[PDB]
C-alpha cells in the first residue's frame with residue numbers, strides 16, 4: 419500500500435479493500451517516511467486500540 | 468496415473484466469483500484414503516450455525 423513499486427494515476431485511483439488481519443500502525447504514524455499524516459475522525463494514537 | 472499418486476484435476480463449481488469480501492485457505496495437507504476395515508467404518512457429523 420505505502421511501499422507499492424508503482425502507484426495509480428489519480429484519474430483512475432485504486433480503491434483497495436483490507437480485512438481478516440491486524441492494523442499495526444507502529445511502523446506508520448511513528449515512521450519518518452511521510453511528510454504528512456493527518457487523521458480526520460480518529461486520533462492516530464488510537465489506531466492500535 | 469503412473470506416478471502412484473492421487474491428483475485433483477476437476478474443479479467445476481462456479482463460472483464467476485465477482486465480489487469476494489471474505490477469503491481463507493488452510494495450510495496445505497496431502498489428502499488420501501488409507502487403512503481398511505470392510506464394514507461401514509466412519510461416522511462424521513457437522514453443526515452449522
Ligand SMILES: *[C@@H]1O[C@H](CO)[C@@H](O)[C@H](O)[C@H]1NC(C)=O
Nearest residue numbers: 420421445446449450451452
Ligand atoms: C517499507 O518496507 C520496508 C521493508 O520492505 C521497510 O524498511 C520500510 O520502513 C517500509 N516503509 C513504510 C513507509 O512502511
Ligand SMILES: *[C@@H]1O[C@H](CO)[C@@H](O)[C@H](O)[C@H]1NC(C)=O
Nearest residue numbers: 468469470471472473474475
Ligand atoms: C504426475 O505428477 C506430475 C506433477 O507432480 C504431473 O505433471 C503429471 O501430469 C502426473 N502424471 C499423471 C499420469 O498423473
Ligand SMILES: *[C@@H]1O[C@H](CO)[C@@H](O)[C@H](O)[C@H]1NC(C)=O
Nearest residue numbers: 433434435484485486487488
Ligand atoms: C460488486 O460488483 C458490482 C458489479 O460488478 C460493482 O458495481 C461493485 O462496485 C462491486 N463491489 C465491490 C466491493 O467489489
